[PDB]
Amino acid sequence: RTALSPGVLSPTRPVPNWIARPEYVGKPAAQEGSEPWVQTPEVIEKMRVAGRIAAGALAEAGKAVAPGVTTDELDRIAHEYLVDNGAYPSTLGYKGFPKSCCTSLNEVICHGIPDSTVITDGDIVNIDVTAYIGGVHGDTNATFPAGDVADEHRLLVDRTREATMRAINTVKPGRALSVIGRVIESYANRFGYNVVRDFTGHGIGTTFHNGLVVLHYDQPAVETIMQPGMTFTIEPMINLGALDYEIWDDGWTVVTKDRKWTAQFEHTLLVTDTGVEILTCL
């Protein structure tokens, strides 16, 4: 299976005019980065709605993953499930991003832009979908196998899913945020994999990236302590190869330099009074 190359982009997909657009739509930058890390009860409830819709959109698009399909098509499907549910696709118009979800095949670490690229037997593809409704965001992603995937790749995907669930299970108030990256990296290294460091999880709420950064590798210098009402993503990218990468001319598509495949899974989490709640569930 040859290394991927930029495909061709379909035109901007329309969104019903009555669905509110986040404030950054169409602008070069977003007004985000200094919002409270702990959300109000109102916002937490709204985030449950957003997270459920994003989860449903991810699941719909994931069902279309099959050899023969284009990533653009996956985008068409998630976009339509969001709009149908009254949600705006947060990535659409986010810092110029042109589509409604990110589709990251094989060696694309993250932020692949859905295009003409056709998926072939044995590929793996991450679909990342964010919903904006009720003035809040919810983000989730998962990597899906297409046809007869090699065992190496099936294990990568399964172990990345397991690393993410183990990290989620450690979320609890009063525990250091750095426990998450410790847990992910220890599990990825058990199998000889490498955890991407330059791309991270993040606080999410009324803004898409609110300033809070969640690392997926071991970095005990971070002193942040998890607090009830904090909302953030856990979304480790795990590489079979080296971490060195390149970003395509589009300014979005990140690919591994050695072209070895990489997988990712993600949920939006809430720190509750005693533990965790996954908000991006159906």
Ligand SMILES: [K+]
């Ligand atoms: K990938």
